[PDB]
Amino acid sequence: ADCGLRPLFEKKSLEDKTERELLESYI
Amino acid sequence: XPXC
Amino acid sequence: IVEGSDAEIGMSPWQVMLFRKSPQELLCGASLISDRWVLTAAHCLLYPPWDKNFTENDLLVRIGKHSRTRYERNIEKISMLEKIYIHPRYNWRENLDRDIALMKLKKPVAFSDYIHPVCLPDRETAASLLQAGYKGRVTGWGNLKEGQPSVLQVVNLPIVERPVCKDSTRIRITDNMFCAGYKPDEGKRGDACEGDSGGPFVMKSPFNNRWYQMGIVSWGEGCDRDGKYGFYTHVFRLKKWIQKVIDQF
Ligand SMILES: *[C@@H]1O[C@H](CO)[C@@H](O)[C@H](O)[C@H]1NC(C)=O
Ligand SMILES: [Cl-]
Ligand code: NA
């Protein structure tokens, strides 16, 4: 139900140091 | 071969 | 992981370490997909040409870890296995087709800031995100070059077009695999390596912000060689088997 949302990241509205690289690769 |  | 960098704390809280009991040693990575199921590569458990054939009591999984070697008290969880299930059509004789295995924990693990399951993709998520050029992420405590890290490593790598993957090797690639890594012309480097096998290749969905396990580290020829790519078990293609094992329990 809660799979794939990290307690120390998505659940706290924080982003990790390289996930932006993944997001940008989509465009 | 296999990851190993 | 070659050319990666230290993971942040809790960056991959589905990451699992598969550990041999006797002698003590890290065997492989793996991932937590629920409170009691762990996914890994079949070749981590069964590979007759190397006389590898583990039974449940040969192994432990360690969940919640950051340090490769330190016992992380109050953070990590060490679990025993109740049963191993290997894909009945895992092809170890030829090319590691369907390189996938599930392990059921003897008791469910409690989640925490450091322990949390990754999603498996459905049809729409696979169709949308498994496209050449889109990047995913590989993590593990494997070798730093084809040399072990102090803490969990992470690197992001692009999915590569099937004909380029096939051009890169004489091993027969099937639709149950995909490859990823930079091309020689892209300048950037990076690959999984020995010890990372079994661990997850994940993608963060841009539609719902959830992380999905799209691949399992399966095979490669060397690590980070120019013109070679890492190969990954295609999790979604083998999902009906996963669901069958989980349902039937
Ligand atoms: C692996 O080990 C088990 C242990 O009893 C044995 O029954 C089985 O034949 C072995 N599997 C393969 C594929 O060699
Ligand atoms: Cl299947
Ligand atoms: Na390469």
Author numbering:
A (entry chain L): 291 to 317
B (entry chain I): 1 to 4
C (entry chain H): 321 to 466, 475 to 577
Give sentences from the paper.
Prevention of pathological clot formation can be achieved by specifically inhibiting the serine proteinase α-thrombin, an enzyme that occupies a central role in the blood coagulation cascade, where it plays both pro and anticoagulant roles. In an attempt to discover new anticoagulants with lower risk of bleeding, a new generation of peptidic DTI derived from the d-Phe-Pro-d-Arg tripeptide scaffold was developed. The three-dimensional structures of three complexes of human α-thrombin with peptide inhibitors (general sequence d-Phe-Pro-d-Arg-P1′-CONH2 with l-isoleucine (fPrI), l-cysteine (fPrC) or d-threonine (fPrt) at the P1′ position) were determined by X-ray crystallography. The structure of the proteinase in all the complexes is very similar to that of the unliganded enzyme (248 Cα atoms of the heavy chain of thrombin can be aligned with a r.m.s.d. of 0.22, 0.17 and 0.12 Å for fPrI, fPrC and fPrt, respectively), with minor changes mostly in the side chain conformation of specific residues.
All the inhibitors bind in a substrate-like orientation to the active site of the enzyme, forming an antiparallel β-sheet with the Ser214-Gly216 segment of α-thrombin. The P1′ Cys of fPrC establishes Van der Waals contacts with Trp60D and is hydrogen bonded to Gly193 N and Ser195 OG through its carbonyl oxygen. Its terminal amide nitrogen (N2) also establishes solvent-mediated interactions with Leu41 O, Cys58 O and Lys60F NZ. However, in the fPrC and fPrt complexes, the Ser195 side chain is rotated away from the catalytic histidine residue, therefore disrupting the canonical hydrogen bond, and interacts instead with the carbonyl oxygen of the P1′ residue. We suggest that the catalytic triad disruption in thrombin∶fPrC and thrombin∶fPrt impairs the enzyme's hydrolytic ability, as proton abstraction by His57 NE2 and activation of Ser195 OG is no longer possible. In the thrombin∶fPrt and thrombin∶fPrC complexes, the side chain of Lys60F is found in an extended conformation similar to that observed in the thrombin-PPACK model and in the unliganded enzyme. However, the presence of d-Arg at this position also results in the upstream residues sitting deeper in the S2 and S3 pockets, thereby increasing the distance between the Ser195 side chain hydroxyl and the P1 carbonyl carbon of the inhibitors (3.69 Å, 2.85 Å and 2.96 Å for fPrI, fPrC and fPrt, respectively). Of the three tetrapeptides, fPrC was found to be the least selective, displaying only 3- or 20-fold selectivity towards both factor Xa or trypsin, respectively.
